[PDB]
Amino acid sequence: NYQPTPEDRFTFGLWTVGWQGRDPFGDATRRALDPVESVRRLAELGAHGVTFHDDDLIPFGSSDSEREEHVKRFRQALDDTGMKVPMATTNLFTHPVFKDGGFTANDRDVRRYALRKTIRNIDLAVELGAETYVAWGGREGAESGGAKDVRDALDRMKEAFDLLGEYVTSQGYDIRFAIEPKPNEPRGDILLPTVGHALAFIERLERPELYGVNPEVGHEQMAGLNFPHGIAQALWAGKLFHIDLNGQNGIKYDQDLRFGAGDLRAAFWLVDLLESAGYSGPRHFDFKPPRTEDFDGVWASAAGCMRNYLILKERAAAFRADPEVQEALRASRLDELARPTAADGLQALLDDRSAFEEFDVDAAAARGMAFERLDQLAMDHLLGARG
Amino acid sequence: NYQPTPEDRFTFGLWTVGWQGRDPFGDATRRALDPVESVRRLAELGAHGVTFHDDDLIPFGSSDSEREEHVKRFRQALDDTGMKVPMATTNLFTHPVFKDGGFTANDRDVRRYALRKTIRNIDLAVELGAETYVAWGGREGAESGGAKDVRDALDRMKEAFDLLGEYVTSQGYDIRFAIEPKPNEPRGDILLPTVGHALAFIERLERPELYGVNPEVGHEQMAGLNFPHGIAQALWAGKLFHIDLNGQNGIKYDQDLRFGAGDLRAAFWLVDLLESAGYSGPRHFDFKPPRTEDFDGVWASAAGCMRNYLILKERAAAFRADPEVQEALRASRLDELARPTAADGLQALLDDRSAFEEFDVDAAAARGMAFERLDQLAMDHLLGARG
Amino acid sequence: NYQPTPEDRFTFGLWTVGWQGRDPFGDATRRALDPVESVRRLAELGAHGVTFHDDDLIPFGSSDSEREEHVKRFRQALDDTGMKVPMATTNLFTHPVFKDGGFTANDRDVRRYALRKTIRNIDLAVELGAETYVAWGGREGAESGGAKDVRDALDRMKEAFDLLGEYVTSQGYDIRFAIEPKPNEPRGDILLPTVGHALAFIERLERPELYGVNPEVGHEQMAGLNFPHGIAQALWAGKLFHIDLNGQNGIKYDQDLRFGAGDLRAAFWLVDLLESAGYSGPRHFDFKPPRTEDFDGVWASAAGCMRNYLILKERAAAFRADPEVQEALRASRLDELARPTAADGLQALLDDRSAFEEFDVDAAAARGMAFERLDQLAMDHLLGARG
Amino acid sequence: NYQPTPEDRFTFGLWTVGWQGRDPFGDATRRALDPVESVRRLAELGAHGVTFHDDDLIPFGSSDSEREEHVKRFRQALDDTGMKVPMATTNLFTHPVFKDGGFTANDRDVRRYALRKTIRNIDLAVELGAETYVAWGGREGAESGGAKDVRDALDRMKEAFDLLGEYVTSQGYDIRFAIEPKPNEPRGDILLPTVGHALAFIERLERPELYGVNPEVGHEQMAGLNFPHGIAQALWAGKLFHIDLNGQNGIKYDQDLRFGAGDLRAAFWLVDLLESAGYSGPRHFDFKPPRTEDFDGVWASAAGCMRNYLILKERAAAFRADPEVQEALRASRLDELARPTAADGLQALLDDRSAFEEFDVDAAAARGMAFERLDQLAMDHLLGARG
Ligand SMILES: [Co+2]
Ligand SMILES: [Co+2]
Ligand SMILES: [Co+2]
Ligand SMILES: [Co+2]
Ligand SMILES: [Mg+2]
Ligand SMILES: [Mg+2]
Ligand SMILES: [Mg+2]
Ligand SMILES: [Mg+2]
Numbered sequence A, B, C, D: 001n002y003q004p005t006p007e008d009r010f011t012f013g014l015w016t017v018g019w020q021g022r023d024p025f026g027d028a029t030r031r032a033l034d035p036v037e038s039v040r041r042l043a044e045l046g047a048h049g050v051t052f053h054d055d056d057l058i059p060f061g062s063s064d065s066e067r068e069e070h071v072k073r074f075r076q077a078l079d080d081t082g083m084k085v086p087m088a089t090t091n092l093f094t095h096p097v098f099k100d101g102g103f104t105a106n107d108r109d110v111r112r113y114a115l116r117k118t119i120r121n122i123d124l125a126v127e128l129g130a131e132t133y134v135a136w137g138g139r140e141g142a143e144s145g146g147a148k149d150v151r152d153a154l155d156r157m158k159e160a161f162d163l164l165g166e167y168v169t170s171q172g173y174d175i176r177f178a179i180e181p182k183p184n185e186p187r188g189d190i191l192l193p194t195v196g197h198a199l200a201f202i203e204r205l206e207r208p209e210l211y212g213v214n215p216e217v218g219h220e221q222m223a224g225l226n227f228p229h230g231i232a233q234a235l236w237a238g239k240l241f242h243i244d245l246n247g248q249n250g251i252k253y254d255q256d257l258r259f260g261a262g263d264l265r266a267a268f269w270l271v272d273l274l275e276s277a278g279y280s281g282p283r284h285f286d287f288k289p290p291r292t293e294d295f296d297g298v299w300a301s302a303a304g305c306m307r308n309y310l311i312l313k314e315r316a317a318a319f320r321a322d323p324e325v326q327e328a329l330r331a332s333r334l335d336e337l338a339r340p341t342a343a344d345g346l347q348a349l350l351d352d353r354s355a356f357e358e359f360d361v362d363a364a365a366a367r368g369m370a371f372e373r374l375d376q377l378a379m380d381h382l383l384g385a386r387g
Helices: A035-045 A064-081 A108-128 A150-171 A195-202 A217-221 A227-236 A264-277 A295-321 A323-331 A346-350 A361-366 A371-382 B035-045 B064-081 B108-128 B150-171 B195-202 B217-221 B227-236 B264-277 B295-321 B323-331 B346-350 B361-366 B371-382 C035-045 C064-081 C108-128 C150-171 C195-202 C217-221 C227-236 C264-277 C295-321 C323-331 C346-350 C361-366 C371-382 D035-045 D064-081 D108-128 D150-171 D195-202 D217-221 D227-236 D264-277 D295-321 D323-331 D346-350 D361-366 D371-382
Strands: A010-013 A049-053 A087-089 A132-135 A176-179 A211-213 A283-285 B010-013 B049-053 B087-089 B132-135 B176-179 B211-213 B283-285 C010-013 C049-053 C087-089 C132-135 C176-179 C211-213 C283-285 D010-013 D049-053 D087-089 D132-135 D176-179 D211-213 D283-285
Touching: A010 A295, A035 A049, A035 A064, A035 A295, A064 A108, A087 A108, A108 A132, A108 A150, A108 B346, A108 B361, A150 A176, A150 A195, A150 B227, A150 B346, A176 A195, A195 A211, A195 A227, A195 B195, A195 B227, A217 A227, A217 A264, A227 A264, A227 B150, A227 B195, A264 A295, A264 A371, A264 C264, A283 A295, A295 A323, A295 A371, A295 C371, A323 A371, A346 B108, A346 B150, A361 B108, A371 C295, B010 B295, B035 B049, B035 B064, B035 B295, B064 B108, B087 B108, B108 B132, B108 B150, B150 B176, B150 B195, B176 B195, B195 B211, B195 B227, B217 B227, B217 B264, B227 B264, B264 B295, B264 B371, B264 D264, B283 B295, B295 B323, B295 B371, B295 D371, B323 B371, B371 D295, C010 C295, C035 C049, C035 C064, C035 C295, C064 C108, C087 C108, C108 C132, C108 C150, C108 D346, C108 D361, C150 C176, C150 C195, C150 D227, C150 D346, C176 C195, C195 C211, C195 C227, C195 D195, C195 D227, C217 C227, C217 C264, C227 C264, C227 D150, C227 D195, C264 C295, C264 C371, C283 C295, C295 C323, C295 C371, C323 C371, C346 D108, C346 D150, C361 D108, D010 D295, D035 D049, D035 D064, D035 D295, D064 D108, D087 D108, D108 D132, D108 D150, D150 D176, D150 D195, D176 D195, D195 D211, D195 D227, D217 D227, D217 D264, D227 D264, D264 D295, D264 D371, D283 D295, D295 D323, D295 D371, D323 D371
Parallel strands: A010 A049, A010 A283, A049 A087, A087 A132, A132 A176, A176 A211, B010 B049, B010 B283, B049 B087, B087 B132, B132 B176, B176 B211, C010 C049, C010 C283, C049 C087, C087 C132, C132 C176, C176 C211, D010 D049, D010 D283, D049 D087, D087 D132, D132 D176, D176 D211
Antiparallel strands: none
């Protein structure tokens, strides 16, 4: 079972299945993929769409003539397959000119170039039908404390995002921005290192409604944080515009394993949350097939991403549908959590003797939360050991 | 040298020097301190003031008569010494009734009790002259994924803080709230786990101007984050109302070492930032004298907190005053970071051929940032090896 | 299904189901359990046996008369139920006298007391039938660099273990020692912090054959290490005398969650390894029912430990029995890993032109390892989605 | 002051100052350095010697004729400068053929090639005067649990090191091996991940006397471990053959910052330990000048490594020479830690009533350890604030 179809909204970056396997300590183990081939292979696997950095699709430094040629080839493949392009992004991290950042480089001329490079790819993204434009500021940061005045850097980051918002507004584009946080790597510390920091920063931009977050499973886990909790906070704020699914084993370098690998229980609770909240954006995989693999392993790893999502969706749905779990949720008072604490108001609460003066603290304290029985029912459903 | 005086604004919680040394694996190693003794001993060391949880000062469950007696004794000590009380907080974590939280407990009656307990201590805090009321939601969280619906929990957290804001507003109190984040411990994950998450949450409250953050050095470091960077972002947003200084060696249990211990370079860059930004709130120490120590070691550890701040202040001031460092800052273009990227505007930037069409990317890329020479000058100043 | 019976060799510490819920920030949430009740409740759940610290069974400071009374009660419960006692240990961490360690306290008189306290419990352990005596040196360590000369401390640690080996040898006891590592908590750093460090230390003792390791799942994961890999190395060295099973979510305070919780895939690979290696010692649970729970939750959490082991055993057995997985193992050359590299010898290897001079490095490099397909078959078996 | 000279025994890998700045997300920012230039520039800075991987000095796949040419050029530079070559190593990680390991690749032909490549460089290393041959098994490991049978892999690792020991023994070379641990990166988990694991493994080799450890500051810190403690254990076992000095900020990707950067207090305690133990091997820097830097920054970063060692040496010497610190060491009973616990023997200890029956546990427990005052004296000396 568990066969993916375009309705499941699975998407992949060109840079994922196309990663050649160069890491900090070793050369490439796979040949370069033609983006046209990736589109066609991904359509056959059941993918909904692909995403791209500008430099994935058009080699850096291409003339206007070579650029048009690369885009026409790619567009021809999309038209042939029905594959969509729901998101695009800029590469502001690979070329040595960005070694101190794009939007927050100390050199002003680099920051201006960073903005012009980004604006050019927004035009292309809109033409191809992208609804979300992601920014991962992988070089915005520092290895040493004196290298970056962070208040000034946040001024420059705000300036850049405000100029991008003025640009899409003046052009009448119907595209929104999503900031992708990462705590570190390749810089010693990266600015806006978590979902929370990015959410707070958005609230100081001139047009906050145009901006949300693109959280990545492995990135929040690189700070030891609870990724489903962070996603819940983004949904609560109305800012989950896009999401990057993959796996990560704890606090270390960014692994970008296939989704389902790494923290399996966190993946179950994430899928439970996305599906119960009715998230309807792309389920995008930002993963790297390990460099141990040949090209057959690349496609097996990509298929595995989708398969694991579909298995977890089924288990989470069965968990929530189980009357025994519904009873367990009531026994742990999850339903009381949904009731207002004091809809009767501040005055009524102050004069309520049963909330303080006459509150029986020892009886309340003796009540068990029954959380372990609930969690073991969740474990049983995840493992298919109910029945 | 480095003798502290009240003008340095050093403050200590009653619960810091008063920690009896009970940890998860062992009994208390020190006798309980009388809060009156702590006030007098801290005044002799040069402290500006003390802070308190309600339960530090008034034993839980005290009658109105015993309560008034504990407060009069404490007030008499403050009047005798001139010690100030700039901040207070609620204990919503020790008593078993709070085992699933205060503001976000699943049980509604517990949430109501949590609010009444907090409101009662706000009245006392204002009477004693506190300007900041801190909330550390140490029990708000979960060990397992199904125990807490996080969107509902954030609704209840918002409800509680909005009711506290309505209360201080209706009473005409001149006190502000500061949320203290912590990523984990004693819960498996705590809600609002970092400075960023707390800053983002404040922006959804009804009266955001009343609320800021109380970041703690060790807590951000428990997520492997850069504490000076996080403080810079709080200052940039106008939300650094208070701060907890201590030390922490990496990602593990919350150590609350004396300030200066743990990550020494991060402490240098923090002091550099607080002093150059002109932060003027209390320099509050939330630390625990290790349970290896007797009472002489408690006071030596407390004196060490203040001493290390004063030494780092001197080194950071000398670093910024050094003409050789000023030259190094220009060589790394820290001054260009302060210039707007495009004050000429979006249209001018789009038509500027030198920002893209004619931008010499290879010349820009070849420029060294000279960050290592700058950082070694910082190291030399920290270690007193200049000259 | 998945009902435990005594043949599954599941054991529990008295201190596990008996944890009253006191953590660093809160009071106890459960009443104390009578060890006799724990024996009887654990026998009803299907447990094989119980383990104990001296101070769990005999309150500290008991006279010879009260001591004999506590032991007779406990012995009567064991005889009534058939429950076994396969392991015992000393509490050298709770009482304030041990605040700087037992075997490596700076104070010599404390080290002597630590040895006499331990020797007394070895006598009792042997009388009750224990085959393994565990030592967890939770207080051996330091918060600051100058407090402990670590070479001298390792001398004292070696001295203590050598004296214990001389004692059991002179008494003719048939009991072996197992060192339990932990990287930190309650000390800032603990000596012998991982399985590897403990294995290396054993090799410098006078009688290494008497000593092995008692690794704990969560403890190695507190250093971000791969617990199955560490267990493999202990088995390879012949030193896995005992094991502590529980769960842990990443690098933070020691959670001691029920087994199966935390890193679920690591638990699958651990059970796969223990069962395929034919480990035949106790499957011991060192876990804490969360303090949110009442007494019903305590027993549900304990039952969950055993249930999760039995489910994972079934899935791992089905994984290894699957002919499709056996084919995948050959495709990834797991079988070639078992062949000697050069049983033909050093001289033959030096003169083998096909190992270097004529080795086709590009053909070898192009071979895929097929690891992702293998790992997805493992995922399918863990989740019960094969068929 | 703090000028390095050859007597300080500072050494650098060719791959350190020669790192071109390629990281997982970006291209090279510096041109390649000619090894002859690196020798001459390092001699001018005051370095004692250089180290190399085979592939740093001889491009992979070179004929016997090109190989001899590269070696003669390098040898001519050494003879011209007096620079020594105290250590060499093999590159078994960069070429795609090693994507699953060298000594523990699943493919047997790769393991044989790995051994022949290593043996060839041992011959060259001895000819140039190296006394230590390092092995960093950076590709020995796995991203997924089924890919590697770790017991079989340790068999193959033991086989390889035993064959290398047979080879140097049969040739009569006076060179010893040092294993360099790393917990992860570039593999998801690396075999022998810490100093402890490597020390334990050495004890199972046929000729353990030929093998020790080459611990790296940042690598142990990637597991959150205390690097000075681990070095103490290696010295206690007689196995510290070599050491890699650099800096690392906590648990994340391997940063290889210049020595002194990262955890500054840990660097102070390390230098204190190396100097008080009389370690006399090379002080080798395995660091990467950040890719933000041009070639002037490369040499400033390299000079900074040596400068920071010399400053910390001076501060640690002054700390130990201070009569006030000696008094503090006695007050914390560091001297009692050096006394045997029970040189009177097991029988005397058993019959000593003052060690148990008459031991006054409450008086002992009340003694303060005075560790905080000692640590603040250490802080004062590190910062040059004594006097
Ligand atoms: Co990633
Ligand atoms: Co804290
Ligand atoms: Co534990
Ligand atoms: Co390194
Ligand atoms: Mg991503
Ligand atoms: Mg605090
Ligand atoms: Mg244990
Ligand atoms: Mg190294």
